[PDB]
Design a protein around this nucleic acid. Structure first.
Ligand SMILES: [Cl-]
Ligand code: NA
Length: 131
RNA sequence: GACACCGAC
DNA sequence: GAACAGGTGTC
């Protein structure tokens, strides 16, 4: 474990359903950011937004710490700069799809060296940002 | 299919 | 705390 890191995760009520996410200091569990709930989204959209918010957070603070995510899906989406969600686009899902499109747009207009690391839940237990 | 992840004593 | 039925994604 790279203890000098940011861990991020989604939490939801329903999937699809109400989605939020947070970022914590891996060593302490201190909460560094938390997103206001978004009324309908998916687990994987939330995981993606959490990583990209973490990138933005660390870049603004000139931090070189890595990010841990437990999401193989979201780590791939970030590497690709494309969130390949199945969630239908409708008036109910407009909000989350706007956030996702904006996060992709951030990735296409900024650089980062931040390592995005898979949290190994099977070895290490739940990620520290788990709800 | 395998894997990573997220309502109801 | 501990003991069936879902969706969202990749490989
Ligand atoms: Cl960054
Ligand atoms: Na985890």
């Amino acid at each position: 474990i790279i203890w000098e890191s940011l861990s991020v995760d989604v939490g939801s009520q329903g999937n699809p359903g109400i989605v939020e996410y947070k970022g914590v200091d891996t060593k302490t569990g201190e909460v560094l950011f938390e997103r206001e709930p978004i009324p309908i989204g998916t687990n994987n959209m939330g995981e993606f937004l959490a990583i990209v918010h973490g990138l933005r957070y660390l870049k603004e603070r000139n931090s070189r710490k890595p990010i841990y995510s437990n999401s193989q899906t979201a780590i791939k989406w970030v590497k690709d700069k494309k969130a390949k969600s199945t969630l239908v686009r409708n008036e109910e899902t407009a909000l989350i799809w706007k956030l996702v499109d904006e996060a992709e747009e951030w990735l296409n207009t900024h650089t980062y060296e931040t390592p995005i690391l898979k949290w190994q839940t099977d070895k290490w237990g739940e990620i520290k940002a788990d709800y």
